[PDB]
Design a binder for these strands. Structure first.
Lengths: 113, 66, 348, 274, 120, 113, 64
RNA sequence: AUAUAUUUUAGUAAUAGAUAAAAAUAUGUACAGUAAAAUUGUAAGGAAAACAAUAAUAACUUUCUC
RNA sequence: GAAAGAAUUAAAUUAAUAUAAUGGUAUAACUGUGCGAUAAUUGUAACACAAACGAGUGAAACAAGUACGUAAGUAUGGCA
């Protein structure tokens, strides 16, 4: 008799980086099949709707007044901040670079277009 | 089996360049059953027509009046 | 016949071209259009039939309407209402429509398009709303010049900038353009065209060019930088080009320092903001304001805080954005600024 | 594509950015079709519409007078009912569908000077069923329609598939044409005067015909179409005439009002009314 | 020859009888003087008809009773007695000798055409 | 290649089609364009005025009817009831025809039934 | 065996090939991609000469 | 009127709409819109062709107008 | 008072989506459309996810060039 003895190894597909957690640019904050959780402040969404890290900060699953009936998962650049950020305000931004204090290093970077 | 006219490549009407179909129409005088004339715009080339069987001689449209 | 009268009404409402006016108002379609300059083309051209008598009738109808409006307009006391009435009276005038549509609005000649006249001003506003204002708004939103500097904008004045003194070429800067360090080496020229009814004598203005994207390595973020700051500028609907001619050295709260972006620091937004002064009652003449020049700093500048302090309202804005090129070092050297930093290509 | 996640970003200003105007792509398309500079320009108000003028003068006032009911309040239609909150499962529950119907029905307003019933649009649906065999029949039907109306027809295609009737999916079969304004009025006038009297045993439009809300319809056979003066002109060129459905759409709140309006324009009504 | 009275005819076809043929409301003597009033030289074919002339031709047929218009009159005369107690009505309704002919044998003809709306 | 029926269908199609039947675009001079605009705008204004006049008249009629019916209700209840009936199957009389372009031979019928 | 693989060669005489997969009757493919060797985009035509199903020329001009 | 040259026309063919749930291309981009079901209908037409109609207007602006 | 617009709320993801089933979908991934037909490109890939290994999955970024878009931009094949 035919036996339905076949099934597929389940896909590890859940939050992989939880709240208040400290991520790093390019980490998987939540595998998911579906945009159950939408990309939010400072985060990126991959092909499969997987959500990843863009700035090194703190993951914060927060609703949003603008986009109702939805849930985001962002990453404030600091804990003190609340990712359901205000809006009408400056946007936290990160420079991310170290000024070549080395003469040689600076020269090479400059001299080279 | 199915009788058809097989399509050629369609001519690309560009966006904005589409023009409305203003068909050639003549002002045609219709004289009804009685002498009441009425002007109507019509595509067939005939300046004057006089009608035999109209509402103006049908009993349904005026009950009181080979 | 109110539209033929020019006793009380301005000269600008008429067409200054005589031939055009004659063509507009004739008894038969005999003459040929002044717009078509070439004889052969004039010969070829054929205007649509019966257009004259109907046009005349339409003119009479709308002229009558204008006259009726004027009967109300003169009785009205409050100024905004009166202006609105005037607009209603003259907006359908063919001559004013001709004038506005087919002559330049940016560098308007006073005899053709007078922005002192309410109707023309209304037309100019409408034109601005149709395209230029929308574009400006888009460039502010997309580039993120609103929330990053100054929360919102309610565009009232059309602001256009130029860089005449640096290179030599004449070009009004389109919002969100990439300008070279050579182009923006010397200061810009503003034109703040105001379309609302405003007290020309009393109303002063301030202009602030701010650079939100200069890197602060202590904070690991950016800080603002007031690159150019003018205060207490007098505008007039026709006389509105803010040039070293007009403003004095007293008006300059922070004299123009050029865009000198660092290598790999990125693209730097330079978003000029135009504010109008708070108008005080029971005081004849222009009410000035003093700025604490030690208090406001150029290397770090809270624009919003400044606005709060002096009770400003942002009416207009414009934006360009500069990034590093070969000549920024030369510009720095000219201005006597230091060598200029060089950052890592990677944003690690 | 890095992702499929659609998410419109909020803005920091109340100015309404028309994106079409900021481009330089379609300069002819920036002009309205009403504007002379557009290639889409057409002279609209070419001559005085006769039926419309009649409606304005005689009928509209009469209709208003007829439809006056004293202190008539609004009759709300069947709508989606909310749940009583007598259980915590009602809390984000979608509302119960309407009482009788699955779809919601509109509110019926009292007739006043603003909302008097009037002609809105005519649609002439001609689906020729022999065109499952012959595509050329659809073309002929479309031409006929054009001749009748003086308006450009739109081709009907077979939306469904079915074996019993020899019908494929995606096959051109007859045509339709939505008449509006003056052309529609003319078409109605022609129907009233020329065509419908030449139909022999013609009692009228049925009183049981129509939508529930301000829409009345009827149809003409292939025999009836040869009375149109454009077809009459060259009946030779119209051997296989095609029948048609005629959907009249009014601005009437209810169907009896629409029927009354149509009667005002000399349309006879015969059957027992609902 | 053309679309005369809709179902027209052909040229070469002398009109006199041609009318008796296509038309059902007119035939033989009726068609004969029908041309007489319209005064068309006898032995005249359709092709020769001066269109305007056909116009008169048309009106003429409108004057008297032609086309299946009369088919009905008889249909009713049939239904008449038929609706009353009439041997005919049976003979006609059943499809049998309405002229009391050979029901026993030669009656297929009756069955073939004799019926409520006989002239089909 | 094609049958006579096919040819005739093609001809019919052509009648409807815009292929090589339509003129050049209606170009205007700037003065002419202005004149056209002024013609159209004025016309539109006139049409609006006419609509308002008619609309106003209708409103006035409605008000008069309302005034009448209240008075009727106050005075004679039976008369009011008679006035305010459902006129569901009310049909305009077939003599009230849509006014033609030119009048008939017999303008008015003095006898009837 | 309903799909196969061709060998889109690079116009620039570089040798670079971008093997792609095609149906059996593959409208002679010609793709414009990057030729690393010549540091620039360039058109890639097929290499081995295969075949295309008799595809009718479209009648842009009215005829017969 | 009419003849010769010369040409021009007529090769008659759909979309005229930024089209929008018939069939056609399924990768990119840019712009724009909303479906299905059901019920009252309607030449043939019917359970089953196509077609039409089927929520709410506070506020806001513009235009006319008493 | 009226028109017209802009729309807003509700309802909807039952339609549909290249194909199963689930997950997602109107902020539309779905549909129409213009352009195009290029990123169904080329080197270094951090870093995670998953994971015995071999493998697999997301992918910041640096660099070379292409495409579309006023622009913001988006695009290293397809809603997954």
């Amino acid at each position: 008799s035919r036996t339905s003895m076949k099934d597929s190894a389940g896909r590890r597909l859940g939050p992989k980086k939880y709240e208040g957690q400290d991520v790093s640019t390019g980490e998987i904050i939540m595998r998911q099949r579906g945009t159950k959780f939408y990309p939010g402040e400072n985060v990126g969404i991959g092909k499969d709707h997987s959500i990843f890290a863009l700035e090194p900060g703190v993951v914060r699953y927060y609703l949003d007044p603008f986009h109702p009936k939805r849930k985001f998962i962002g990453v404030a650049l600091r804990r003190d901040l609340k990712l359901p950020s205000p809006h009408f305000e400056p946007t936290v931004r990160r420079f991310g670079r170290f000024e070549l204090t080395n003469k040689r290093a600076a020269y090479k970077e400059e001299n080279s277009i | 089996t199915r009788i058809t006219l097989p399509r050629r490549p369609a001519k690309k009407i560009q966006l904005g360049k589409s023009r409305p179909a203003i068909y050639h129409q003549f002002n045609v005088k219709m004289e009804l059953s009685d002498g009441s004339v009425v002007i109507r715009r019509s595509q067939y080339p005939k300046g004057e027509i006089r009608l035999i069987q109209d509402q103006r001689n049908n009993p349904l449209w005026n009950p009181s009046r080979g | 016949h109110i539209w033929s009268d020019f006793t009380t009404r301005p000269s600008s409402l008429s067409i200054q071209s005589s031939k055009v006016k004659n063509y507009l108002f004739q008894k038969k379609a005999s003459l040929d259009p002044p717009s078509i300059s070439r004889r052969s083309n004039r010969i070829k051209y054929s205007p649509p039939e019966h257009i004259d008598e109907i046009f005349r009738m339409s003119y009479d109808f709308l002229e009558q309407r204008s006259s009726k409006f004027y009967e109300l307009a003169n009785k009205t006391k409050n100024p905004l209402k009166k202006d609105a009435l005037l607009i209603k009276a003259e907006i359908n005038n063919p001559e004013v429509q001709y004038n506005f549509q087919f002559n330049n609005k940016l560098n308007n000649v006073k005899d053709i398009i007078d922005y002192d006249v309410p109707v023309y001003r209304h037309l100019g506003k409408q034109h601005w709303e149709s395209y230029g204002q929308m574009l400006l708004m888009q460039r502010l939103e997309t580039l993120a010049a609103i929330p990053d500097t100054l929360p919102t904008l309610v565009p009232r004045a059309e602001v256009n900038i130029k860089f005449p003194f640096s290179t030599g070429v004449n070009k009004w800067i389109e919002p969100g353009e990439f300008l070279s360090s050579n182009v923006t080496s010397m200061r810009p020229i503003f034109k703040i065209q105001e379309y609302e009814l405003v007290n020309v004598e009393k109303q002063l203005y301030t202009v602030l060019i701010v650079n939100p994207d200069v890197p602060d390595l202590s904070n690991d973020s950016f800080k603002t930088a007031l690159c150019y700051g003018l205060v207490n500028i007098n505008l007039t609907y026709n006389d509105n080009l803010i040039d070293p001619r007009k403003f004095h050295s007293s008006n300059i709260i922070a004299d123009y320092l050029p865009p000198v972006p660092e290598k790999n620091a990125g693209k730097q937004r330079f978003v000029v903001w135009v504010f109008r002064q708070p108008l005080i009652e029971d005081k004849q003449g222009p009410n000035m304001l003093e700025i604490d020049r030690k208090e406001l700093s150029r290397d770090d500048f809270d624009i919003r805080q400044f606005t709060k302090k002096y009770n400003l309202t942002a009416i207009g804005a414009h934006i360009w954005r500069s990034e590093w090129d070969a000549k920024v070092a030369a510009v720095r050297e000219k201005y006597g600024l230091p060598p200029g930093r060089v950052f890592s290509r990677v944003r690690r | 594509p890095k992702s499929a996640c659609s998410l419109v970003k909020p803005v920091h200003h109340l100015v309404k950015i028309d994106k079409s105007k900021l481009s330089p792509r379609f300069p002819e398309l920036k002009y309205d079709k009403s504007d002379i500079r557009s290639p889409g320009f057409k002279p609209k108000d070419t001559h005085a519409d006769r039926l419309n003028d009649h409606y304005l003068n005689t009928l509209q006032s009469d209709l208003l007078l007829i439809n006056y009911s004293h202190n008539a309040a609004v009759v709300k239609g069947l709508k989606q009912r909310a749940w009583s909150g007598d259980s915590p499962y009602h809390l984000n529950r979608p509302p119960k569908n309407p009482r009788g119907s699955k779809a919601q029905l509109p509110d019926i307003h009292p007739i006043k000077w603003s909302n008097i019933p009037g002609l809105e649009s005519v649609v002439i649906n001609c689906f020729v069923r022999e065109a499952r065999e012959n595509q050329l029949l659809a073309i002929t039907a479309a031409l006929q329609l054009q001749q009748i109306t003086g308006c450009k027809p739109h081709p009907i295609f077979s939306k469904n598939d079915v074996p019993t009737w020899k019908l494929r999916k995606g096959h051109q079969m007859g045509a339709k044409v939505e008449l509006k304004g003056k052309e529609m009025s003319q078409f109605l006038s022609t129907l009233t005067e020329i065509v419908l009297p030449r139909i022999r045993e013609y009692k009228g439009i049925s009183n049981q015909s129509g939508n529930r809300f301000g829409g009345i319809s009827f149809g003409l056979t292939a025999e009836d179409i040869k009375f149109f003066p454009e077809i009459d002109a060259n009946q030779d060129s119209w051997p296989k005439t095609f029948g048609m459905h005629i959907n009249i759409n009014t601005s009437a709140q209810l169907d009896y009002q629409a029927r009354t309006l149509l009667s005002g324009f000399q349309f006879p009504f015969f059957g027992e009314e609902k | 020859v053309v679309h005369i009275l809709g179902k027209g005819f052909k040229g070469k076809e002398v009109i006199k009888i041609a009318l008796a043929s296509k038309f059902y409301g007119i035939g033989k003597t009726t068609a004969e003087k029908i041309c007489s009033k319209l005064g068309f030289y006898p032995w005249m074919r359709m092709h020769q008809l001066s269109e305007p002339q056909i116009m008169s031709i048309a009106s003429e047929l409108s004057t008297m009773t032609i086309e299946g218009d009369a088919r009905a009159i008889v249909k009713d005369n049939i239904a008449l007695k038929r609706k009353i107690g009439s041997y005919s009505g049976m003979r006609h309704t059943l499809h049998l000798p309405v002229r009391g002919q050979h029901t026993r044998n030669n009656a297929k003809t009756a069955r073939k055409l004799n019926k409520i709306d006989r002239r089909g | 290649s094609l049958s006579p029926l096919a040819q005739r269908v093609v001809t019919q199609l052509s009648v409807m089609s815009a292929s090589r039947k339509q003129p050049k675009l209606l170009k205007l001079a700037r003065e002419d364009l202005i004149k056209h605009q002024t013609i159209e705008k004025c016309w539109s204004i006139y049409q609006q005025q006419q609509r308002e006049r008619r609309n106003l008249q209708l409103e006035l009629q409605y008000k008069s009817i309302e005034r009448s019916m209240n008075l009727l209700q106050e005075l004679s209840p039976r008369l009011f009831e008679a006035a305010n009936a459902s006129e569901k199957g009310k049909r305009f009389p077939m003599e009230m025809k849509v006014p033609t372009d030119f009048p008939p031979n017999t303008l008015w019928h003095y006898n009837f039934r | 065996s309903k799909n196969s693989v061709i060998k889109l060669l690079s116009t620039a005489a570089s040798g670079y090939s971008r093997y792609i997969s095609i149906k059996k009757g593959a409208p002679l493919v010609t793709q414009v991609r990057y030729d690393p060797v010549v540091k620039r985009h360039v058109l890639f035509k097929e290499a081995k000469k295969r075949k295309v199903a008799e595809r009718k020329p479209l009648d842009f001009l009215r005829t017969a």
